[PDB]
C-alpha cells in the first residue's frame, strides 16, 4: 500500500 503507512 502507500509506503508512508497511511491508508489510500
Amino acid at each position, epitope marked *: 500500500q502507500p*509506503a508512508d503507512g497511511n491508508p489510500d
Partner: antibody
Amino acid sequence: QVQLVESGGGLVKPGGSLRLSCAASGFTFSDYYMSWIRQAPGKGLEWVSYIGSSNTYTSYAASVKGRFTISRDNAKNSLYLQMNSLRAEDTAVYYCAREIERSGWVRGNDYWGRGTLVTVSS
Amino acid sequence: EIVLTQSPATLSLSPGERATLSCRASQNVSTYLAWYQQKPGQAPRLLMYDASKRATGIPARFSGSGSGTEFTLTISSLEPEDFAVYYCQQRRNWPLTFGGGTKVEIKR
C-alpha cells in the same frame, strides 16, 4: 546474502512488556522498508506492523494498535518491536521481513528472518 | 478490512500433477496480491507479487494470475518440494491481511 536475525523473544507474564530486535545484513538497511509478521502455533500468518523510511511512517494491525510500536535504527541496521500490555493471544513466532517497494507502494515481503518465539503466560 | 478466503483449505495431489490454488478477496485489490510458500519449521518464502510477478529464484512452474477479487496460483507440475502450505496476502490497503492458507499434500 541477505540475512535477517530476530532476537529478544522469550517468556513474559500477561500485562508485561518485551522488546524484539531484528538485525539486518547483506543489503543497505536504510534503502528498505520493513514489517513484522507473527504466527501462532499451528495457525496462519498475521501481519503485525510496518515501518517506512523512519519512525515517522508506521502502520499497525488493529489487534495491536496502542500496545505495540515498530521502530528502526539505521545506524545499527536494526528493526525493533516494543510490545506492551501483552496477552496470552500474542503468543507466536514473530518474523521480521523486508518489503518490496516500487512507485511509492510496498508490495510484498521478499526476505524473512528465522523468527523469535514470544510466550505470554503466567 | 479486506478479507481473503483460500478454498479449498487442502489439496491432495500426486507429484507431477497440476495444482490450482485460489484466493478470493472481499474487495477490489486490483493486482496488489502476493503469494507465499511455507514448509514446517521454516519461515515463509515469497513466490509472487503484483499478482503475477515471480519472485527471485522461483521456478517457472509457478505462475500467478488474476485481478480484482479472484486470484490463482498455478503449479504446472508438482515437484516433491512443492508440497507445503500457501498463503496469499493483499497489498491494496492498510491493514495488511492474509488468507487462511491452502495445504498441498501428497495423495496416496
